[PDB]
């Protein structure tokens, strides 16, 4: 019967991945597994999650200019 | 400018505001607006005077982009030289053009013309004794060339092999090349009496890419672009019809040598003994003053120690002085030493007939240097909607690869990860149930996938035959009749076989479940299998390409650079992110967890005589 | 939409303010126009009688196919209080609102009417090329900062702190530029009448200072829509706080005046869109590249192509452009929508997309008669690119809040998981991993019962 700081997103498991690896990389991430489509993610790092995630997926997407 | 003060909107064109191009008063009849920037040509196709622009704009311009209502065109060197070679002077270029705009033709783009179009035809590669010239009817044009001196009325013999470079220098400097052959005039080579069978009837667009090509009463070397399907072959024996002098066609694979040399025998008036074939297993030449011979580029490009028999027909070919080469697939000549053999072989007409004019690397425009410009690019579009070749509906399927594959998806090398994110279960299932479903419909699929482990496993897995590189001929034959005959047989698996030039039963359906990198031949190469279909003349018909990919993969990144150059062509690529029935269909492949989590194990765990008796 | 709009805002009044603001007759006409047909009719039939009136009559009036027209048309008559109905004798006895009755009476016969259509002082300027230049002139103006071009003129802080104050277009202080929201590019969707009404509206909710009085600016407002263009009013006969917002709606471009502090002012053609309305410019062509051929000279239509189209070059009758992903993301930075953007699109289709569709869905209906489709004007791979991006722009959704667990009792769990529940703030619950989700709103509650 214990509290902690943290907020939730919503994804599928490729996005849950992605996550799960930048919490390798960085350790102050995401606190703890919920499933395989929730996680509970540190707020003050929250945009950085979104900020890093928008940038790394763009090697899957051709760009020309 | 024309004294015009910029608007507070003309801040996000980065000097592109053509704004100050006074509108005529009747705009509205003519169809063109020209940018000075780029001299970039846009045609709108619903307004009077359409057609009667459009044919003027794809003789003097290159097609960027052709949609349904605006048409891009972009003017070009290469464009203007052909322009000018049909006989169309500057002045009317340029008067045709300010009728046919609404802006007024802006002075940049007039001095592009003038600029490009002078100075066409002061060079000439002329080719005599099986030895290269070239010719300048001005003096001062020979004395002033003096950077690139490979010299061995006016003109002086360059040596054979650098015939590519003085084409590139010449290229560099404003004195492009004239590449014309007068065979009409040309009587040291010995004719042929080959013309075309009176049975044999031509397509109006072959029409129009062979008045392309012999616009002027002479045989311009350069690239004629059709799709499979619409009759390259058939472009390629009117042409030989046309020159009526010795021809060397050079093709990718021994097939296609085989039926290049039927289809001269089928289509057009040409002897057997006329006819010659220069492979591994057939090495006789013909014995008339002048022929056909048919050979693979490998077999001409040979720099290995080849055959005596092979040495002496190689040493006749190289000492005749051939009128006409056909230059099959000429998208892999600018390869390392297929470059070779457009100086090997000296000919006085150079025709590259490809389906697929693009490569992955820069050397595709290489091509203008070694055959010549780009003759004649077939609407894709205008040919699929009147019937000549088959309406395919290219679609995209996203397949969401699963949790446990991702995983060890992230973590993992290229080449271990290619692999992964190609056997993914829902691939699998997407597979399964696109073949259930058109198998349904009374379609013949052919599946690509070019890797071939992934090839055996879908195969085994879904119950249908597959063709790949190491099975032998016999079987792949018999596995063909079968596909195109037994109705049992609706589903071939085909690795990278099918995507190089190889005799197919006709197709209606394609799934793409893996691909060799951002190939963009290959993509096209592969659409190309279902684009001849028997069914064009049936109302309502329609082909159907697939490209299953795995999603958020590097498969998005390699599919979209594929599907570039087929949107390029035109064809919109609709995405399938959801297949009505995945659930319920009877048997799923890899549906429990746990014939999954076993298909990731096995994905993973693949990666004195008498001394003579001792020997 | 429009009437709507102006219907909720005079519902919002209160009846003691609607009885004051039925005094000037100009004001009953504009109301009047704005109520149903059917209303207007039992208004107009209701008006030359003194006596009384019976529901029961105009419930016989209705024919039996449009009864629901008329519940519509007593409720919105009765919410506005133009009716006050009578229980007398036992019958449902209906009197029209008696201000508003001798209003709309001087109005239509002539009469009193203090002025509240105006006086005109007969010395008059062009409409076309200085009273609709100058209208034109300040729209643009406002627009053109709105959607965020560069401008060497900018509005004033009046419509600068309105535009700021708005559910519309946020500003950050931190970069310092004034940025679009989804109601900004929305705002851009409906035709300016409306426009002008969101913005009326908007400056309406915002006047609650007591240097404004709501009822006269109503009036004035419901006075500049009953006005004729192209000939000046003089202003003796408006009040000050009249007086100020008339020089509020001459920096909004409504009104055009010669001078400050003029005793005349020249309403312009936008006073007279503020009652109702009434190839085109701006007319697009998409294809399967996704290259946009927009037939627009006008710097305003160009300035909103730029939010989501990558320009490439301009000529007179169109600006090439090409969408992008990075431009849809730039819209969708800004909180635009897919579904407003393709309806955008849609709204400014060419008429050669729109026959290409016909003759399509014609191909169409005599192949497949069974099944009918819509008139899909532009093409579908652009509309599904575009919803595309917007769901990889929309992959992940976060809330924050608090999850709640090591709990070593079940029931305590399930308690408070039900009690979330109850509340309705509960995102996730699950008795497998004993965790429950709450919103940040809804943590509160939760913390409150779990303390006590």
Redesign the interface.
């Known amino acids: 019967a214990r509290a902690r700081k943290g907020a939730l997103v919503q994804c599928d498991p490729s996005i849950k991945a992605l996550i799960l690896q930048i919490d390798a990389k960085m350790s102050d991430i995401v606190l703890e597994e919920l499933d395989d489509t929730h996680l509970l993610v540190n707020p003050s790092k929250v945009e950085f999650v979104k900020h890093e995630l928008n940038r790394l997926l763009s090697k899957n997407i051709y760009n020309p200019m | 400018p024309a004294d015009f003060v910029p608007?507070?909107?003309?801040?996000?064109?980065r000097s592109?505001?053509?704004?100050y191009?006074?509108?005529r008063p009747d705009?509205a009849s003519r169809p063109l607006?020209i940018?000075p920037?780029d001299g970039?040509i846009?045609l709108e196709s619903?307004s009077p005077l359409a057609e009667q622009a459009q044919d003027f704009l794809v003789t003097i311009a290159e097609p960027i982009?052709r949609?349904?209502?605006?048409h891009?065109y972009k003017i070009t060197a290469y464009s203007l030289y052909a322009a000018v070679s049909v006989g169309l002077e500057t002045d009317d270029i340029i008067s045709v053009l300010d009728r046919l705009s609404?802006?007024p033709v802006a002075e940049s783009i007039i001095n592009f013309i003038k600029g490009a179009t002078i100075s066409y035809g002061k060079v000439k590669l002329v080719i005599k004794h099986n030895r290269y010239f070239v010719e300048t009817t001005q003096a001062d044009i020979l004395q002033m060339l003096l950077n690139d001196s490979v010299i061995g009325v006016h003109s002086f013999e360059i040596a054979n092999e650098s015939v590519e470079v003085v084409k590139k220098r010449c290229q560099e400097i404003d004195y492009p090349v004239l590449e014309e052959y007068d065979f009409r005039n040309d009587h040291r080579n010995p004719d042929l009496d080959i013309d075309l069978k009176p049975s044999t009837q031509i397509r109006p667009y072959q029409e129009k890419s062979l008045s392309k090509m012999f616009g002027n009463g002479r045989a311009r070397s350069g690239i004629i672009v059709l799709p499979c399907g619409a009759g390259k072959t058939l472009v390629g024996i009117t042409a030989a019809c046309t020159i009526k002098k010795s021809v060397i066609v050079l093709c990718t694979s021994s097939v296609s040598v085989m039926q290049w040399r039927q289809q001269f025998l089928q289509w057009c008036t040409l002897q057997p003994e006329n006819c010659a074939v220069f492979t591994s297993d057939n090495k006789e030449m013909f014995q008339t003053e002048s022929g056909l011979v048919v050979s693979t580029y490998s077999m001409v490009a040979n720099t290995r120690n080849r055959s005596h028999d092979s040495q002496k027909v190689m040493d006749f070919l190289t000492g005749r002085e051939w009128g006409f080469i056909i230059l099959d697939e000429v998208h892999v000549v600018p390869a390392a030493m297929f470059r070779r053999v457009v100086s090997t072989i000296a000919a006085h007409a150079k025709l590259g007939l490809t389906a697929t004019l693009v490569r992955e690397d820069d050397k595709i425009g290489d091509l203008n240097f070694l055959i010549g410009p780009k003759l004649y690019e077939a609407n894709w579009m205008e040919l699929s909607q009147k019937g000549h070749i088959a309406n395919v509906q290219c679609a995209e399927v996203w397949c969401?690869?699963?949790?446990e594959f991702?995983?060890e998806?992230?973590?993992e090398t290229a080449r271990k990860r290619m692999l992964l994110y190609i056997m993914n279960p829902t691939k699998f299932q997407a597979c399964q149930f696109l073949i259930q479903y058109h198998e349904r419909r009374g379609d013949k699929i052919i599946v690509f996938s070019d890797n071939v482990y992934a090839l055996q496993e879908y195969a085994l897995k879904m119950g249908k035959p597959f063709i790949y590189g190491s099975t032998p001929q016999q079987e792949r034959m018999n596995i063909l009749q079968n596909f195109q005959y037994n109705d049992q047989i609706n589903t071939i698996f085909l690795s990278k076989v099918g995507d190089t030039s190889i005799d197919l039963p006709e197709a209606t359906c394609l799934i793409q479940i893996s691909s060799h990198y951002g190939s963009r031949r290959q993509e096209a190469q592969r659409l190309g299998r279902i684009l001849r279909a028997k069914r064009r003349n049936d109302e309502?018909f329609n082909a159907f390409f697939y490209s299953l990919v795995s999603?958020?993969?590097?498969e998005?990144?390699y599919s979209?650079?594929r599907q570039?150059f087929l949107?390029?062509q035109?064809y919109?690529?609709?995405?399938i992110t959801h297949l009505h029935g995945m659930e319920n269909i009877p048997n799923l492949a890899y549906a429990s967890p746990r014939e999954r989590r076993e298909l990731l194990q096995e994905v993973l765990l693949k990666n004195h005589p008498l001394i003579r008796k001792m020997y | 939409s429009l009437k709507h709009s102006v219907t909720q805002y005079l519902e919002e009044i209160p009846q003691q303010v609607q009885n004051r603001l039925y005094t000037s007759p100009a004001t009953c006409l504009a109301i009047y126009r704005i109520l149903p047909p059917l209303a207007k009719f039992f208004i107009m039939a209701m008006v030359f009688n003194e006596n009384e009136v019976p529901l029961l009559d105009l419930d016989k009036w209705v024919n039996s196919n449009g009864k629901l027209q008329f519940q519509n048309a007593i409720k919105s008559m009765k919410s506005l209080h133009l009716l006050i109905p009578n229980k007398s004798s036992g019958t449902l006895m209906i009197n029209l609102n008696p201000t508003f009755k001798i209003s709309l009476r001087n109005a239509l016969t002539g009469g009193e009417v203090q002025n509240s259509f105006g006086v005109v002082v007969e010395e008059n300027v062009v409409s076309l090329d200085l009273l609709d230049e100058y209208s034109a002139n300040k729209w643009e103006t406002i627009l053109h900062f709105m959607v965020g071009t560069p401008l060497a003129k900018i509005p004033s802080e009046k419509v600068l702190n309105l535009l700021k104050h708005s559910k519309l277009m946020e500003e950050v202080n931190s970069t310092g530029e004034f940025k679009i929201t989804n109601e900004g590019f929305q705002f851009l969707l409906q035709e300016i009448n409306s426009q002008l009404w969101t913005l009326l509206l908007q400056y309406l909710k915002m006047i609650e200072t007591s240097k404004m009085d709501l009822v006269d600016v109503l009036h004035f407002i419901f006075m500049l829509g009953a006005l004729e263009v192209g000939k000046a009013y003089k202003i003796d006969a408006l009040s000050e706080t009249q007086r100020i917002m008339l020089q509020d709606m001459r920096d909004y471009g409504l009104v055009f005046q010669k001078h400050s502090n003029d005793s005349i002012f020249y309403p312009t053609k936008l006073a007279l869109m503020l009652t109702s309305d009434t190839i085109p410019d701006g007319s697009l062509i998409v294809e399967t590249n996704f290259k946009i051929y927009s037939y627009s000279n006008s710097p305003l239509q160009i300035a909103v192509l730029s939010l989501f189209v990558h320009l490439k070059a301009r000529f007179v009758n169109m600006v090439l452009g090409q969408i992008t992903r990075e431009s849809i993301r730039r819209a969708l930075t800004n909180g635009i929508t897919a579904d407003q953007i393709i309806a955008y699109l849609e709204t400014h289709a060419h008429p050669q997309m729109r026959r290409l569709a016909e003759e399509k869905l014609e191909k169409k209906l005599e192949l497949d008669p069974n099944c009918k489709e819509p008139l899909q004007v532009l093409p579908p791979t652009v509309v599904d690119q575009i919803r595309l991006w917007q769901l990889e722009l929309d992959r992940v959704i976060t809330y924050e809040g608090s999850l709640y667990s090591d709990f070593e009792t079940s029931q305590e769990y399930n308690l408070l998981s039900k009690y979330a529940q109850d509340i309705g703030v509960l995102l996730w619950k699950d008795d497998k991993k004993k965790k429950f989700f709450i919103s940040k709103e809804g943590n509160s509650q939760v913390l409150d019962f779990a303390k006590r």
């Open positions: 608007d507070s909107v003309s801040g996000m064109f592109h505001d053509f704004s191009l006074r509108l705009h607006w940018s920037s970039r846009i619903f982009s949609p349904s209502h605006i891009e609404k802006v969401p690869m699963t949790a991702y995983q998806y992230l973590r309502g999603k958020d993969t590097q998005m990144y979209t650079k570039a949107v390029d035109g919109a690529f609709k995405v």
